[PDB]
Amino acid sequence: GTGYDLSNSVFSPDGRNFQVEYAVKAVENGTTSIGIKCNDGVVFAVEKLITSKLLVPQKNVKIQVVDRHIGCVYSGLIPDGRHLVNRGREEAASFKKLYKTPIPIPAFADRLGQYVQAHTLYNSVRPFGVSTIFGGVDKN
Amino acid sequence: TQQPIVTGTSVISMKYDNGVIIAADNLGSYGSLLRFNGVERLIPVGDNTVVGISGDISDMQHIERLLKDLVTENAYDNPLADAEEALEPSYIFEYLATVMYQRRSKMNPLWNAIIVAGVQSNGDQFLRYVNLLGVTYSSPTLATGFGAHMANPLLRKVVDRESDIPKTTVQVAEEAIVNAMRVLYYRDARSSRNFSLAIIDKNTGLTFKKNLQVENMKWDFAKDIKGYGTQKI
């Protein structure tokens, strides 16, 4: 039979989660964005389509800061990216609150990872319609 | 409901013609034991605000961490963070005041007296007080705990009403403050000689002075005082 693709946490007979695969289509459809690691830091850039002269330039900022030392950029469904960055902010506050030091980047990565994965565990949520490129400088 | 354990004594402050001055000594007392000597109780937020805190030090450290967090948060999705949408002293004050009042209302206070000193974006001087009850007030001079008894009367001789503010120079003001710290060191048993002072000036910006010392103390007359009435030698 079929219908494997109608519901989020469902494994298809070949072991795939189709809804996640469809989320990836939403990403591919989005604006292009990149990150480049350099010898002492990271650089993030994004393409911002101008739909009309009417958009105030410089104004609809897309890159987001998490804590003081982390930058995030994403392609796809933008509101999804925001939601993910909100969570990243709570998640980093929590870490700083308890451990005093600002969150290490690999630690931070995993926090976002676990939250995103969480949204492929149940059919009462949809997966995230973004890929996120993010990074920073930490203790090492 | 709690009781303060490690405490900081007075925070004193006044406004002059261009800005505001605020000072506090570097002591953390533990009852009558003068326990800790390296304690900074002036908290600068941005470059236009200094929050000076007395009372319970563990609570001060909590408020410290709240203020770091406010900076982080205001910077989020804000491309005018370091310009028109930076934190004003009035924002920082009204936030703290909110916290302090909600905390007393839950019968679990932050055991502090706080003075927020700064310069607004239109150049106006900001000086307001908030304590553990959530009580707030402004005046051309403001001091906490012991300082309200001994600094205010000295500082009020210099600025005594609003109209005295344009007449007062940073030299005259800082002198008045420095003198008040010496008086407090003479008569407050919970005070230290070492202190920090900060000026927030609409032209010069923020000057933060650390490791000051009460200088120029009169003790000589002590040699002529003997006994407690009839004793001659």
Domain positions in chain B: 1-233
Q: What is the Cα–Cα distance from B133 to B131, expressed in whole angstroms?
A: 5
Q: What is the DSSP code (8-state) at residue B83?
A: T
Kindly report the CATH number that applies to the domain delimited by B1-233.
Answer: 3.60.20.10
Q: Which of B4, B43, B26, B64 is nearest to B193 (CA)?
A: B26
- Other residues' Cβ atoms within 10 Å of the Cβ of residue B173: 23
Q: Would you state the structure tokens that stand for residue A118, as one six-digit string?
A: 């969480």
CB contact at 8 A, B87 and B36 = no
Residue A27 contacts by C-beta under 8 Å, 6 or more apart in sequence?
A75, A76, A129, A130, A131
* DSSP secondary structure letters along B118-172: EE-TTS-EEEEEEETT--EE--SEEE-THHHHHHHHHHHHH--SGGGSTT--HHH
* SS3 state of residue B54: strand
Q: What is the Cα–Cα distance from B92 to B89, expressed in whole angstroms?
A: 5
Report the residue of B69, B72, B73, B80 to disrupt the A interface, i.e. the one with the largest count of A CBs within 10 Å: B72
Method: X-ray
Angle between helices B57-75 and A78-99 (to 10 degrees): 160
CB contact under 8 A, B76 and A93: no
Q: What is the Cα–Cα distance from B186 to B119, expressed in whole angstroms?
A: 31
| Resolution of this structure in Å | 2.8
Residue B111 contacts by C-beta under 8 Å, 6 or more apart in sequence?
B2, B3, B4, B55, B56, B59, B132
Q: Which of B172, B130, B180 is nearest to B150 (CA)?
A: B180
Burial B32-64 (b: 16+ CB within 10 A, else e): eeeeeeebebbbbbbebbbbbbbbbbebbeebb
Burial A9-42 (b: 16+ CB within 10 A, else e): eeeeeeeebbbbeebeebbeebeebebeeeeeeb
Chain A hits for B75, CB-CB cut-off 8 Å, are: 65, 68
